[PDB]
Structure 1
């Protein structure tokens, strides 16, 4: 998947809390489902189609998890972060 050709997520940076460093993009096969923001060097539980996935992010916004077949959540460091 070529993230360079993906439109940015439609996000709202909350002023009261630290700004999340990463964009995430969820796909089934080649098809974008949704996108958002998340923290680097962190963890979240996210529902990915029919399964919860525990997603870990590294310092560079690479996302790791046990994704169900055909699905992925891909991370990118935000510009300026």
Structure 2
């Protein structure tokens, strides 16, 4: 997994709220399943395969949480943020 080789998520930054600073990419057994946006220095709840995961983001979009086996969600700061 090199996130520099991952195409951008299919994002929509709503103009009515702050732009999220992170891209997230979800993998099962190292194959991309989906991708999206989330805020840095923040938190979200995300369905990761069969489980709900509470995912914390740091200031560089490093993501942490209790992922089920086989699954990961990796973050990266969007260009210019």
TM-score, normalised by the number of residues in structure 1: 0.98
Kindly provide the CA deviation profile for residues 22-70 of structure 1, in whole angstroms up to 9, marking residues without a partner as x.
Answer: 0000000121110000000000010000110000000000000000001
| Unpaired runs of at least 5, structure 1 | none
1:46-61 alignment, distance < 5 Å: 46-61=46-61
Q: Partner of 1:47: helix, strand, or coil?
A: strand
Which stretches of structure 1, 4 residues or more, deviate above 2 A after TM superposition? none
- The residue number in structure 2 matching 1:14 is 14
TM-score (norm 2): 0.98
List runs of 5+ in structure 2 lacking aligned partners.
Answer: none
What is the alpha-carbon root mean square deviation over aligned residues? 0.4
- Structure 2 CA distance, aligned partners of 1:16 and 1:60? 24
